[PDB]
Design a protein around this ligand. Structure first.
Ligand SMILES: *[C@@H]1O[C@H](CO)[C@@H](O)[C@H](O)[C@H]1NC(C)=O
Ligand SMILES: *[C@@H]1O[C@H](CO)[C@@H](O)[C@H](O)[C@H]1NC(C)=O
Ligand SMILES: *[C@@H]1O[C@H](CO)[C@@H](O)[C@H](O)[C@H]1NC(C)=O
Lengths: 264, 261, 261
């Protein structure tokens, strides 16, 4: 006789709407990630902020794929780079004054341009000597700034610093990572990898008290990495899917009405 | 005259169903990944398992952003940390007995807390001296455990061990990575970045034969990195998507029927 | 009276057409990434290209989880590995000739197999001595090749090289990363982590002028890490989604006609 079957029809309808709402809520909480790479023809000269306390910069120069042997390992030489001294106050603690030396970074990644730095510390009471360094994207931005101390204070918190020790040569391969945030901020940051090589001290024994620091800065590759967060929750697609499901259920109900019209 | 056109209609129907099934099967095999970061106000004191064979722990202390200079680089000092000695058997080979010293790690990342350790090895025949260490999440979990040896054996396989060498000071910045998989094991693991600094030996030449090991443990940042695997294949969304496609083909047939008539 | 409301109906139709098309265009530009791991029962013996200028290979051997202590740190020993010398021209600059020594890498990861290498450099004028090395996937592929020089020239650009310094022992843990791209290059590359340990020089003072290089090669784990790029924009799904949306406005309008009737 006459049997009611559409109860299951709107039960399935409500069930589908419930799962659609749950799925949309779940997708709203777990954005996926996307990674891309961008090739550059030349880099913008970065800024390297060095923090030598009493160590004096013996030499600095711009080189290419090979560094010529040092004429004199531990004596003053020629400085052939653009440097800028700055004084500011540590944001972490406002009782310590920080003096930094800013050096232009290399640009020609295609020609494997590099910057070679050599410092000397005469004497100290510490038993683990190292020099702090920080990397920021644009040296020109540092130059044309009404408040250089404020720029340095902001970069102290916005960036992370590393160390290089004496008695070694440290080779640093540096790369750029850009990130797109939900609010739309373009966050640029530095990645870096180090390689340490023992320094063979051939200086006379009278000069062995002084400690030498050697460091090299140059780009790893011309590829800048890009990371973006993609949200896979589109309300209009969900609305269209729900509408299509509702139409399908309505036409299935009409077909069932016809079927029970013939026989049932 | 009368021309049959709906042949293409259900041909397109079968076409769409076939590609929908293929897309669903393909999506079932390639789950996407999602990455999030969680900021903490304080960490849970980790456990550092150290394996010094004959080296003796000269000193250990809890510090902050700067370490004061050593009063004496290579003489016994004061131990100011909580340590626990344990013995167990190596899961990799059940013929070797391992003795470990467990140290409770730093807790406050907001104040940049450090743990500083200094060991001394008197003499040995090896020409490459290093000390093994392992990191696990909770020291309290180790403390309150009916079988500490079983805990160590499980952590030996569940975690990865590293080394720090003599004649250096090693600075280790550690971070926490949580991972969620299909069945829900909520795995937690450690990541590190290490920096080595030469030790300027100013000790008298009579004591130069002994090797000094210095190591520092610190949290890199208060951010824990969470990774999850998201499956983008929803069977019920596909069913509703397939259901809607059939309606258009049926609805267009009536419009096509009117055009024929 | 008679009020026209379907103006909003095809306004919503045009809005829904502009949407999902903006979405398709956006999704075609941002493919998602998928990460998987594959367990192996045994690796394939890699090729290690070493570039010692004047340093002579004192010793090479295949070991397991522990290396026995050296019988003599700085004297010639026994070479117990398969090596092949090759000469070619640097692709970066065609005016320099490069001579490489190819060593067949470790094979079994379940037993923690090691390759141990020891070189000696007698004397040189440089003040920073290091040896270059490069890793490629298959040593057998290198062996059976009509042009070995061309193989090395291709591997120079297709791979990246690292260095290991003298006065240290360098331990290298290496792993394989596979990547699937659009047209199917299935690029395989090497990831590596290093650990340096000070070498305790106990040689007589007369032989201290020579530099000793020690290096160890081992697989980190039996997990090959795979990366794929998934495009989430399916035109067939988009067409079906648009088809369902159009029918909703048509049937709702018919219901609206009944409502005003
Ligand atoms: C930074 O302070 C030092 C104090 O020793 C001073 O000599 C130097 O001129 C200052 N430089 C700048 C840029 O303020
Ligand atoms: C644990 O091992 C150590 C060193 O091997 C030794 O004191 C003894 O065998 C064990 N000690 C205790 C307290 O279990
Ligand atoms: C390859 O180079 C080596 C060293 O430069 C030298 O024996 C010769 O030039 C070449 N040998 C062979 C066998 O091709």
């Amino acid at each position: 006789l006459l049997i009611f079957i559409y109860l299951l029809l709107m039960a399935v309808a409500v069930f589908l709407v419930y799962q659609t709402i749950m799925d949309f809520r779940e997708k709203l909480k777990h954005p996926v990630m996307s990674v891309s790479y961008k090739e550059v023809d030349r880099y913008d000269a970065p800024g390297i902020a060095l923090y030598p306390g009493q160590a004096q910069l013996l030499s600095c120069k711009h080189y290419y794929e090979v560094i010529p042997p040092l004429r004199s390992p531990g004596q003053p030489g020629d400085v052939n780079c653009t440097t800028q001294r700055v004084n500011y106050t540590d944001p972490f603690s406002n009782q310590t004054l920080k003096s930094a030396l800013i050096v232009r970074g290399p640009r020609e990644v295609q020609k494997r341009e590099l910057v070679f730095l050599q410092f000397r510390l005469n004497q100290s009471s510490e038993d683990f000597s190292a020099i702090d360094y920080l990397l920021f994207s644009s040296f020109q931005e540092f130059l044309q700034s009404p408040d250089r101390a404020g720029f340095m204070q902001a970069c102290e918190s916005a960036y992370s610093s590393w160390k290089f020790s004496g008695g070694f040569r440290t080779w640093v391969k540096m790369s750029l990572v850009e990130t797109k945030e939900e609010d739309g901020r373009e966050a640029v940051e530095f990645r870096q990898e180090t390689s340490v090589v023992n320094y063979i001290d051939q200086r006379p024994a009278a000069e062995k008290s002084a400690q030498l620091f050697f460091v090299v800065f140059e780009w790893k590759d011309p590829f800048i990495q890009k990371v973006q967060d993609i949200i896979t929750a589109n309300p209009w697609n969900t609305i269209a899917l729900l509408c299509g499901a509702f139409l399908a259920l309505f036409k299935a109900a009409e077909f069932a009405k016809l079927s029970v019209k013939w026989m049932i």
